[PDB]
Structures are given as C-alpha cells and as structure tokens.
Design a binder for this molecule. Structure first.
Ligand SMILES: C[Se][C@@H]1O[C@H](CO)[C@@H](O)[C@H](O)[C@H]1NC(C)=O
Length: 168
C-alpha cells in the first residue's frame, strides 16, 4: 500500500540565511536545503523511486550540471534525490529526470519514502550583498515500479527557495 504523508509545498534553506564566499563564483554544503524522510508511507512490497524537475531557466553549466538562474546576479547548482543529502542527483535541464533509482519495502513490512533538495549559490555578476526573494524551484514526484501503483495518492510535491543573502 501507499499513502501520502508529507506536505505539498516545501521551503528550501533557512529563512533569510546569510552565506559568505573570475565569474562565476561558487559558494554552502547542505545548509540551503529541504530534507524529509517521510513523504510517503509504503508497505508490503511497494517499489518506488523519485523523479525531479527544475522550472528555473538554465543560464549556463559547470562540470555537467546546469547553473539555474534566479536573478541577473545570482544562480544555483541544484541536487534532488532520496532523503540523505549525499545521495542527491545533480540536476540538468527542465525535464523530469530520474533522481533516485528506487527501492522496494519488504513483502511484510512497512517504512516510508523520503526526499531531499539541495542548492548551492553561484554569483554570476558582481555589484556588497546579493539578496534573493522566495522563488519556486521545481518538484519531485514519486515513481512506482515493478507493477506498484500510484493510484489516487498525491504523487508530486513542490519546492520553493527561501529568501537568502550572499555576502561578498
Ligand atoms: C531508512 Se528506511 C527509509 O529508506 C528510504 C529509501 O532510502 C528513505 O527514502 C526513507 O526516508 C527512509 N525512512 C526513514 C529513514 O524513516
């Protein structure tokens, strides 16, 4: 079985957090993130992975991963994936991408399926502080497999970047 147990709208990073440092310049480990181990409850052999999608415009790339634009001065490198931050998948493009290959809970037990979103800021144009306002980032959808069914359960949750300030 499967049930939606998380929230539809999720904020990434602490509200009004401040982070200190040729263009572009990359700043923050897992500070600017959202993590929740319990977004769906799954049981009895339900098999499930995750897809992710970023809606922000791509304004460049670094090492195979897109730089997503927020404003003229600030961009973002983004990762989406399973609960643990180290399992994040670097995002590229604006399409749904596989960000967690998946797992199956045992035939006779129960657990939960989680997710995480992480971003690190990139300075694109220098001006001595850069502030960004609350911005929609994208979404993550569960991906049942092995015959498992999404059914009527809510499949998608969204993410918004909480406002932040970058210090020279
Ligand atoms: C460690 Se069990 C279970 O594993 C799945 C797949 O890795 C993860 O998405 C869930 O967040 C986790 N639930 C917990 C920790 O409560």
């Amino acid at each position: 079985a499967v049930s939606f147990i998380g929230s539809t709208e999720n904020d990434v990073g602490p509200s009004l957090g401040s982070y200190s440092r040729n263009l572009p310049f990359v700043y923050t480990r897992n500070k600017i993130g959202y993590q929740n181990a319990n977004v769906w409850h799954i049981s009895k052999g339900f098999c499930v992975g995750l897809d992710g999608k970023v809606d922000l415009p791509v304004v460049g790339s670094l090492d195979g991963q897109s730089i997503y634009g927020l404003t003229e001065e600030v961009g973002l490198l983004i990762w989406m994936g399973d609960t643990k931050y180290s399992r994040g998948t670097a995002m590229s493009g604006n399409s749904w991408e596989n960000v967690f290959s998946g797992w199956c809970v045992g035939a006779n037990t129960a657990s939960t399926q989680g997710l995480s979103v992480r971003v690190t800021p990139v300075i694109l144009k220098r001006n001595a502080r850069y502030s960004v306002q609350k911005t929609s980032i994208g979404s993550i959808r569960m991906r049942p497999y092995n015959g498992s069914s999404a059914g009527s359960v809510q499949t998608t949750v969204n993410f918004s970047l909480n406002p932040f300030t970058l210090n020279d």
